[PDB]
C-alpha cells in the first residue's frame, strides 16, 4: 500500500505539557537542558492521543511508514513508534565529544560526566542540534521523501529549515501533502489538504480517515 512519511514538531507535544526548547552561556544552557530532560522522567508527563494515533498508524503500515520529528522528547517512542528519526536529536541522549558515539542518558549532565567509549573517558556533549548546527538523519529523510505517497506535517510552524522545506520536496516527488496544526503554519498554503485544531482531536480523526481509506484498520 502507499508509503507514508510523517513530520512532527512541537505542537504535537504541547498538550502533554512539553514547551518549546529555548524559544549562549554554557552553565545556564546546561541547566535548562537538564530541567527539560528531568521533565521527561515525571510520571505526569505522558504521550497524548495524537502520539498514540501515530503509533496505531505505524502498526497498520509497517515498513511503509516513517516518522521524522523535530522534537527532543521521547513521547513518540513511549506511544509505541519505532525507528523514529530525531532530526534535531534527543534530550535523553548525549554524545561523546571525541568518538561521536551516542549514549542513552537520563540524569543531569555535568562537566564531571564522561564517556565510556574511549580509551580515556572524554567529555559528553548534547545530542540535540541547536540552530546553526547540522541536522541528523538527512540522507534517510530525503530518500524517504523521494518515495513518499503521502507527507503529513503535524504541529510544525514552518519557520525552521530544513524541516520547513520538506513539504516542497514532497510536492516535487508527487506526494499528497497534509498539514495538521493548531493554526496555519508559515507554509500552510503549500499543503493540499489541511485540518486545524488541537492535535489530540485533529490527529486521531485524520488517522482514522486515512486508515479507512487505506482499508487498513481502525
Amino acid at each position: 500500500k502507499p508509503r507514508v512519511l510523517v513530520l512532527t514538531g512541537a505542537g504535537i507535544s504541547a498538550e502533554s505539557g512539553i514547551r518549546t526548547f529555548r524559544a549562549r552561556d554554557p552553565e545556564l544552557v546546561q541547566a535548562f537542558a537538564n530541567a527539560r530532560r528531568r521533565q521527561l522522567q515525571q510520571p505526569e508527563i505522558q504521550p497524548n492521543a495524537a502520539h498514540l494515533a501515530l503509533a496505531k498508524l505505524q502498526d497498520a503500515l509497517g515498513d511503509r511508514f516513517l516518522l521524522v520529528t523535530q522534537n527532543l522528547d521521547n513521547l513518540h517512542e513511549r506511544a509505541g513508534n519505532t525507528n523514529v528519526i530525531h532530526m534535531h536529536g534527543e534530550l535523553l541522549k548525549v554524545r561523546c565529544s571525541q568518538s561521536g558515539q551516542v549514549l542513552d542518558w537520563t540524569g543531569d549532565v555535568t562537566p564531571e560526566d564522561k564517556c565510556h567509549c574511549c580509551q580515556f573517558p572524554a567529555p559528553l556533549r548534547p545530542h540535540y542540534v541547536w540552530f546553526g548546527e547540522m541536522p541528523l538523519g538527512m540522507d534517510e529523510i530525503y530518500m524517504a521523501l523521494s518515495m513518499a505517497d503521502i507527507f503529513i506535517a503535524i504541529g510544525t510552524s514552518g519557520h525552521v529549515y530544513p524541516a520547513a522545506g520538506f513539504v516542497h520536496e514532497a510536492k516535487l516527488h508527487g506526494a499528497h501533502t497534509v498539514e495538521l496544526n493548531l493554526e496555519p503554519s508559515q507554509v500552510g498554503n503549500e499543503f493540499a489538504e489541511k485540518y486545524y485544531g488541537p492535535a489530540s482531536q485533529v490527529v486521531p480523526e485524520f488517522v482514522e480517515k486515512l486508515l479507512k481509506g487505506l482499508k487498513a484498520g481502525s
Binding site: F131, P135, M138, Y142, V160, Y161
Partner: peptide
Amino acid sequence: KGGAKRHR
C-alpha cells in the same frame, strides 16, 4: 535542500 538548522 539540506543546510544547517536555521530560522526562516
